[PDB]
């Protein structure tokens, strides 16, 4: 029986190859490279409804210090205590920044005022800093441009002898993170293909066989990245360097795996003695619906991220889903087509015997003794939870970027002269319904300032009553200048600047925020300002929402995948329990990946996992891991007919070797991303690599077949058997 679709792909082989070659030239020529599109179509990092984010906007708007949540700090460092010469340099630098209304919305100048200069000068006197409110939210294309404008201005100004300047802050770091991600894209791909080429060469021992397989991947990759660039260039979707990097590796990984299945099954047909045409159709029947089923799995699974709340996860939804669907379409169409043309010239016939003795022996043990193996494999999957008690997520974006990026360079200057918190201040503001420029209210504010100063983890509290962050009339002319930066110009609100002891990015730092709100609220109670609304924003404030956001939406992403993947498997196999087992075993196996990934990074390497790692990696693990089970289980369906146990044994003989090669390629393809400067993506790549390595070698080899034999006929409910 020759299916119609395979028949037309067979008949229109060369036209299909030409058609996709044309798509890969029309794209990449009529659209800018996907990296360029991401630069022009980046997305803001802060979710638009986070209380911290809107508080930052509210704080800025009232004080006229801009309206974006994207601030940056310019640091001055000198080999000797900063003399008056530095002030002259500082004043000129500030003057230029204040002129550029396009990018520098406002400059909170403090070091220029003697009444507050000492409160910003370094304790050693060799360093000082000034903060800027840049246009455009963090990570947006406007913000990256604005930071560059600021950075160019700082560089342009000639520094006095022995004086250095740097630009830092969350805005500057986010932009440099984007450039580093794009800059390392070339190295990720070059290493990925080079490593895959060596691996495939050993597997097939045929250079020609590998080259055609990779060229199939390249067309798969270019179309995948090509189409996503088209959507991004048209403004239909927002991108991030994680989407660009993750999408590229998935296309190469998923692209190669679909190639291995096509060549793998076809080669097996030749070993059995099938004719060239008959082998081709045999390949299609046994792998066409598997690739389509697996293709929708990765595209569908990654699309579930679109339901996440954080912009990082939300923006992975469409770019990955659209990209994977395109790569799948090329695989299901260009795959068989190149195979047919390659067969016409006799290139794809196996060069070594496709031995199956090794895997059949494993099948005999598993099927004959399912439960004893099942328990053994099930337990070793769960013991990966031993890392969960000691798991500690991290948020310090500094540590997950190269030391030499400009943002980290300035931070290094900050640590050399200031406590690490001085470059990450929190700002607390309260709105009233009346003016506060009276001693009566001032006393209430002073009481509030005292209360916050004693909150655990707090180091300094700038206030109108504390011009230098420490204990000390307001109507004095100099104090009026100070009042112009701590009270609303003529409004009903006041603000304070809070400095922690210890990095706010630590989970301990995050906990300090709720204390501030509670302490401020109780201090405000019992006094006329009790009704005043409180706004809190800053580095710690932002990540309070991140911690609550990421920890929750992870369930939204992972749980949604289980339902979506289960549906795709169910419609494919048309069997209820089989679909559950296909994805169920991988779900139980997530513990093994959890333990392995944490053990390698947190313990062996002493580097905590970035908060993005689990949410981004789990979806791929749950998607690709189920694909291998789908392939194996689909082979059970065909082989059955002699007998369930017999079908399982001979099924693992055929698909046993193919999946292992496919599994290692995907694991190595995702693991190769560790070479990226963006260490965050490397953790995502390694976590996927370790998990898929575990899934292919235990979940697919032992769990699924063992469960398959144990259930017997019910495994294919409601389908009839024998």
């Amino acid at each position: 029986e020759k299916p119609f679709i395979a028949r037309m792909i067979h008949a229109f082989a060369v036209p299909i190859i030409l058609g996709w070659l044309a798509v890969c030239v029309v794209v990449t020529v009529f659209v800018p490279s996907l990296e360029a599109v991401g630069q022009e179509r980046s997305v803001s990092l802060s979710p638009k409804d986070a209380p911290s984010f809107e508080a930052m906007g509210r704080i800025g708007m009232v004080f006229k210090e801009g309206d974006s949540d994207s601030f940056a700090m310019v640091i001055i460092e000198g080999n000797q205590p900063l003399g008056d010469a530095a002030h002259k340099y500082y004043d000129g630098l500030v003057a230029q920044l204040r002129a550029d209304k396009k990018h520098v919305q406002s400059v909170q100048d403090l070091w220029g005022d003697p009444l507050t200069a000492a409160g910003v000068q370094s304790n050693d006197g060799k360093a000082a800093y000034v903060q800027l409110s840049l246009a455009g939210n963090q990570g947006t294309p406007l913000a990256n441009e604005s930071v560059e404008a600021v950075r160019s201005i700082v560089e342009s100004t000639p520094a006095p002898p022995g004086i250095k300047a740097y630009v830092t802050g969350p805005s500057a770091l986010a932009a440099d993170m984007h450039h580093s991600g794009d800059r390392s894209m070339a190295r990720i791909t070059m290493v990925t293909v080079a490593v895959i080429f060596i691996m495939l060469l050993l597997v097939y021992r045929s250079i020609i066989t590998v080259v055609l397989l990779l060229i199939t991947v390249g067309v798969e990759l270019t179309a995948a990245r090509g189409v996503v660039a088209v959507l991004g260039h048209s403004g239909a979707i927002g991108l991030t360097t994680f989407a660009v990097s993750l999408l590229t590796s998935l296309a190469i990984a998923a692209g190669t795996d679909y190639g291995i299945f096509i060549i793998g099954r076809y080669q097996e047909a030749r070993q059995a003695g099938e004719d060239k045409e008959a082998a081709y159709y045999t390949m299609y029947r046994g792998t066409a619906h598997v690739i389509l089923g697996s293709g929708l799995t990765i595209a569908g699974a990654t699309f579930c991220l679109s339901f996440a709340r954080m912009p990082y996860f939300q923006t992975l939804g469409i770019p990955c889903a659209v990209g994977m669907l395109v790569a799948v379409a090329v695989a299901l169409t260009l795959g068989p087509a190149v195979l047919h043309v390659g067969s016409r010239f006799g290139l794809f016939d196996p060069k070594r015997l496709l031995k199956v003795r090794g895997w059949r022996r494993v099948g005999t043990v598993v099927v004959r003794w399912p439960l004893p193996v099942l328990v053994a494999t099930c337990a070793i999957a769960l013991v990966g939870l031993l890392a969960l008690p000691g798991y500690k997520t991290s948020y310090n974006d500094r540590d997950y970027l190269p030391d030499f990026i400009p943002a980290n360079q300035g931070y290094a200057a900050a640590d050399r002269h200031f406590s690490q918190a001085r470059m990450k201040p929190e700002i607390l503001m309260i709105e009233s319904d009346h003016d506060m420029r009276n001693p009566a209210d001032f006393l209430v504010l002073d009481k509030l300032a005292k209360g916050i100063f004693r909150v655990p983890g707090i180091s300094r509290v700038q206030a109108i009553t504390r011009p230098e962050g420490t204990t000390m009339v307001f109507k004095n002319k100099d104090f009026q200048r100070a009042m112009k930066s701590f009270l609303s110009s003529d409004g009903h609100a006041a603000r304070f600047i809070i400095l922690h002891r210890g990095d706010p990015q630590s989970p301990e730092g995050i906990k300090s925020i709720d204390a501030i709100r509670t302490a401020a609220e109780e201090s405000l109670k019992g006094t006329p300002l009790e009704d005043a609304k409180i706004y809190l924003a800053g580095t710690a404030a932002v990540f309070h929402d991140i911690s609550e956001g990421a920890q929750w939406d992870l369930l939204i992403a992972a749980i949604s995948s289980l339902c979506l993947i289960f549906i795709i498997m169910l419609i494919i196999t048309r069997a209820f329990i089989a679909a559950a087992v296909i994805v169920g075993t991988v779900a139980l196996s997530l513990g093994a990946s959890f333990g392995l990934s944490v053990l390698l990074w947190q313990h062996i390497l002493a580097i905590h996992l970035h908060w993005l790692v689990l949410a981004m990696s789990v979806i791929v693990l749950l998607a690709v891991g189920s694909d291998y089970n789908l392939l194996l289980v689909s082979r059970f369906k065909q082989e059955i007919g002699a007998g369930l146990k017999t079908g399982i044994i001979r099924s693992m003989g055929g698909t046993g070797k193919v999946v292992t090669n496919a599994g290692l390629v995907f694991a190595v393809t995702m693991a190769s991303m560790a070479v990226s400067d963006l260490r965050v993506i490397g953790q995502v790549g390694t976590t996927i690599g370790l998990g898929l390595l575990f899934d292919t070698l235990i979940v697919r080899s032992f769990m699924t077949p063992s469960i398959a034999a144990l259930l017997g006929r019910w495994f294919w409910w409601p389908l009839r058997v024998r």
Partner: protein, 74 residues
């Protein structure tokens, strides 16, 4: 029927169906091992809708023994 039994043994141990003889032993004559004979018994179980205990699997070490067991229980 001896034909299908011979076919299954010939396939599993990778020897032509005509070479195998009724008096031949799976392990001694045909060079089988423990897992090979386990697969033999399980395949014969599934082929003819029959079940075997471990007490018998160890007992069936020759083609003729399997033939007698299957034909008697058919």
């Amino acid at each position: 029927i001896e034909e299908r039994v011979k076919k299954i043994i010939g396939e599993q141990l990778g020897v032509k169906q005509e070479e195998v003889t009724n008096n031949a032993s799976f392990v001694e004559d045909l060079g089988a091992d423990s897992l090979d004979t386990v697969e033999l018994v399980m395949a014969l179980e599934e082929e003819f809708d029959t079940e075997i205990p471990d007490e018998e699997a160890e007992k069936i070490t020759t083609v003729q023994a399997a033939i007698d067991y299957i034909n008697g229980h058919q």
